[PDB]
Amino acid sequence: NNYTSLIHSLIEESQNQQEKNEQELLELDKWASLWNWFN
Amino acid sequence: NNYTSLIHSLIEESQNQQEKNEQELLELDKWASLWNWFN
């Protein structure tokens, strides 16, 4: 019934994946913007 | 620039999504807590 500990682990996993996906998206934007500074 | 709003449209959609998945995980946390408090 350890479900409570595991469910909380899933919650954290869900947040680690969103935060990295978003991080990486803003990496792209910085680069694309520096890139468009020349184009 | 339009890569920027596109990046943001994907950052927003990734937020809403992550929040829905967290809500369905919270609802599972409710049922495991109910399971527990009974028995």
Curated annotation (Swiss-Prot), chains A, B:
Coiled-coil segments on the chain, per record: 1-32
Subcellular location(s) of the protein: Virion membrane; Host cell membrane; Host endosome membrane
Positions glycosylated per UniProt: N2, N39
Membrane topology designation: Single-pass type I membrane protein
Subunit structure: The mature envelope protein (Env) consists of a homotrimer of non-covalently associated gp120-gp41 heterodimers. The resulting complex protrudes from the virus surface as a spike. There seems to be as few as 10 spikes on the average virion.
Record function comment: Acts as a class I viral fusion protein. Under the current model, the protein has at least 3 conformational states: pre-fusion native state, pre-hairpin intermediate state, and post-fusion hairpin state. During fusion of viral and target intracellular membranes, the coiled coil regions (heptad repeats) assume a trimer-of-hairpins structure, positioning the fusion peptide in close proximity to the C-terminal region of the ectodomain. The formation of this structure appears to drive apposition and subsequent fusion of viral and target cell membranes.
The name this protein goes by in its record: Transmembrane protein gp41
